[model samples]
Target: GSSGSSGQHQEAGAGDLCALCGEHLYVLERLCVNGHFFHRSCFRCHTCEATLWPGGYEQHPGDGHFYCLQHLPQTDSGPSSG
Candidate 1:
C-alpha cells in the first residue's frame, strides 16, 4: 500500500508568524492544537493569560482556543457514572 510519485522535497525557510503577537517566527516557535504557530513567549492561556507549556495546556476544539489545564471549559457531555 505504498503509492508515491513525488520528485523533489524542498526545505523551505521559516516564515511562520506568531498567532498571538503577530510577529515573524525566527526561533523557538510553538504550534498549537489548531495549527496556530506561536513564539515561546507568546504562548499563553486565552482565559487567564498565563504562560503555558506544551503538555500543560488544553485546546478547545469547538472554538479553536487555547487554555490552561485549570481554565479548561467544562463542556463534557455528561457526568461520570460513578
Candidate 2:
C-alpha cells in the first residue's frame, strides 16, 4: 500500500524554493520526510542530521516524520507471542 505521506516529486524551476535551505534550485528537488521539497544536497536525517543511508527511512504513522534506520521507533511488525 502507498502508506507513506505524499512526498512530491517536481522539477526545479525559477520559482520553487528549496524547502530545506530556502534557495532556488534549477534541478530536480525531492520532498523530504518533513513533507517539504528540498534539493538533493539538502536532504539530511532528522535524528542525526547526517547523510541518508542506503537502508532508507522510516515514516511515523502519526506525524509522518522521517527517521533514520537507527533512530526509527521500534514497532512490532508481527503478532506478539502469547
Candidate 3:
C-alpha cells in the first residue's frame, strides 16, 4: 500500500447552511433568526419573497417563518362587519 494522506477535508460548521437556499455559507454577513442562519441575500419574506432587513421583518411565532411587515398576519381584532 502506498502512502495516501494528502487530501484536504473541510468540515461544516454549526448552522453553516442557508435556510432559504440550502447551500453552504462560506462567509458570514448572514441573518440569524431564532438560531436559524440564512444568507443576507437569501433572507426574504416567505410569502412575498421580498428582501427583508433586521428589525424590518417579522417572524411568525407559530411556524417560525419570516414575513415582511406588509405580509405579516394581523393578530389584532379586525374591524366589525357592518
Candidate 4:
C-alpha cells in the first residue's frame, strides 16, 4: 500500500516533495513515471491503498519487485496478470 508518514521516508530522491502530487512524498516507494509520480503498488492495485512490487511478484515466479501484466496498471489487454 502507499503507506508512509512524514520525515525522511524517501529512498532515492528527496522526501521534501512528492514526485506525483508535489505534496512531499516521504516514501521511497513512491515512483516517478514520465515526470508524473505514483505508488508502485498502485499500478496493480488501483485502490491506492495496496502496493505493487516493481521487481514483480516472487510468489507467482520470476525475480525481484516488478510490475507484471496484472500488476501493471496500464496495458494493452487491460493489465493482464503475467
Candidate 5:
C-alpha cells in the first residue's frame, strides 16, 4: 500500500514545446519575425515558408520555392523586428 507521490514530474514551461511541430525540443531559437518562436527546424517564414536559416531564408530576393522570408504577423502592432 505504498503509492508514489505526484512530485516526480514538474510542470514544464511552454517554451519546452516547438513553435511549429509542437514536439519537445531540447532547445529553441529566437525568430526574427512574427516573434512566434520556433525550433531548430520549425520556424517557417511569415512571407513564404523558408526555414529562416541559410540557403532558403537568404534574407534577400524571393526564393518563392523553398524559402519563406521573415515578416510580421497578420495582425498586432509591436516593436519592429525584421
Candidate 6:
C-alpha cells in the first residue's frame, strides 16, 4: 500500500494567476477593465456581486474601483443640476 501522489496530470498549461482567487489560470483568462487578471467566474461586481461582462462594469474616476450599475455612484455631469 505505497500509493504515491506524484504523477498527477494537469488540465491546462501554465498561465496567469487569478487576482480574486489566486489560482493559476489556463483557460478563459479574463482581464478586468482595470487590467487585473482573473477567471471568468471570478470577475464580478464588488457592489452587487453581479457577473460583470467584459467592458461592462462601471469604473470610478477617482478611486479606480469597479461597481455594478445600481451600486455605482451617480455623478452630476451637468451644470444644469441647479
Best by TM-score: 3
Q: Say which candidate scores most in lDDT.
A: 3
lDDT of 1 by residue, 1-82 (tens): 7998779878644657786767777545656436667888878888888888878988877676788999888666877689
Q: TM-scores for all candidates?
A: 0.62, 0.51, 0.63, 0.29, 0.34, 0.59
- For candidate 5, write residues 1-82 as lDDT tens digits: 8987775656666755665676665533544343344575666565555556744454333432224434632334686898
Q: Answer with 1 or 2, whichever has the higher lDDT.
A: 1
Superposed model 3: Cα runs more than 4 Å off: 1-14, 76-82
Q: In candidate 1, where is summed lDDT lowest over 10 consecutive residues?
A: 26-35
- lDDT (0 to 1) per candidate: 0.76, 0.65, 0.79, 0.47, 0.52, 0.71
lDDT of 2 at 50: 65
Q: What's the lDDT for residue 32 in model 1?
A: 49
Model 4 residue 82 CA deviation (Å) reads: 24
Query: Could you give me the TM-score of model 1 versus the true structure?
Result: 0.62
The C-alpha local distance difference test score for the whole of candidate 4 amounts to: 0.47
Clashing pairs in 5: 49-68, 50-68
Compute the lDDT of residue 79 as modeled in candidate 5. 66
What residue runs in model 4 are displaced by over 4 Å at the alpha carbon?
1-22, 39-44, 47-49, 57-68, 71-82
Question: What tens-digit string does per-residue lDDT give for candidate 2 at 1-82?
Answer: 7687988888656545777678865544555445456666666678787666435766666566666778877655887779
TM-score computed on alpha carbons, candidate 5: 0.34
Clashes (candidate 6): 0
Clashing pairs in 1: none
Model 2 bad stretches (over 4 Å): 1-15, 28-35, 53-55, 74-82
| Model 6 worst lDDT window (10 residues) | 26-35
Please provide, for model 4 over 3-70, each residue's C-alpha lDDT reduced to its tens digit, 9 standing for 90 to 100.
77767655555544544345544367566544555555343533333455555432232332334446
